[PDB]
């Protein structure tokens, strides 16, 4: 099965993902799909996008990153932006549209020089910079 390998955005099955993964009977490359029906174009052009067509790369600051990485440089699991536990903060999606603050995805909503970071799931460490390679590297 193949839904595991998809960036799923809720509120917006395995057969669909499988037939999208093989590109079986498809006149194009299947970049995204809805649960089903497929597209040769993603949101960058329940929604599920192929992580192959989600740039796992950034330029300098990386303000337009949208990957699914959710680990810190220290290797700590990021805390969901919806959660205030362990750490409370003012980073609601309503305050930040299109910056894509869902689940525990590494992000850099304000173009920090650090690059994208996350709130750790470790109470003692509030926030840490996720280790993400640039394309140029």
């Amino acid at each position, epitope marked *: 099965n193949t839904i595991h390998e998809f960036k799923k955005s809720a509120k917006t099955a395995d057969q669909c993902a499988n037939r999208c993964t093989r590109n079986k009977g498809l006149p194009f490359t299947c970049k995204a799909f809805v649960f089903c029906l497929w597209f040769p174009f993603n949101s960058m052009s329940d929604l599920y996008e192929n992580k192959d067509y989600i740039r796992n790369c950034i330029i300098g600051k990386g303000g337009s990153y949208k990957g699914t990485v959710s680990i810190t440089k220290s290797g700590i699991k990021c805390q969901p932006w919806s959660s*205030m536990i362990p750490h409370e903060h*003012s980073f*609601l999606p309503s305050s930040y549209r299109g910056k894509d603050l869902q689940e525990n995805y590494c992000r850099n909503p*304000r173009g920090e020089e650090g690059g994208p970071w996350c709130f750790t799931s470790n*109470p003692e460490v509030r*926030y840490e910079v996720c280790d993400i390679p640039q394309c140029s590297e």
Partner: antibody
Amino acid sequence: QQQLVESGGRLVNPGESLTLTCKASGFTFSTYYMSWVRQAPGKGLEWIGYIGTSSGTTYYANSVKGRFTISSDNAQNTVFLQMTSLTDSDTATYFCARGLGRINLWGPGTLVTVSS
Amino acid sequence: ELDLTQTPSSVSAAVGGTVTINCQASQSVSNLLAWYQQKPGQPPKLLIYGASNLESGVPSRFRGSGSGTEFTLTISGMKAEDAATYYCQSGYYSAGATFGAGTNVEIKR
């Protein structure tokens, strides 16, 4: 050695205005909620306002909302509680605190006395 | 607005004894509750956050539980130093943040 230190607490006449300052040492701002919490002599704690350093967004308690306002200088790791139209009910020790629901860090507090 | 009713006013116990303190809310809060300790001349100390999450450095004898509108705080093995006033607090990004009236804890001796 992450610290919060309050200053500005003094004796004021009723109806006058006063500015308290909290300065943080040994940590990034950053990234945090800064709340003020006061405590009248022999009474309990009363939260009165917060600001998000990054957001700049402020929220004040009803007992205070009309007349108090909170600002910051992130570069200097400083928060300003700016009080107006002080009444006797405002007499309390004022705490600069790190957080809104989870307050890991507290200042020792600065004592404001509204009197003639 | 939001009312946090904290009962009782005061509780007593001897060393090793156990004490339980209640906090009840006018509205639901959904595990957004915190417990603080304060001794005179000092600022409060954070004990519990979430409803159950124990702040680092704090003895395991302190127990937080509850959800919706019903919350409890139980100090199980009680030392002399536990003599303080303890407060329930709920804080949310918005709107607001509010404390309880507090509860005084005496050590029977």
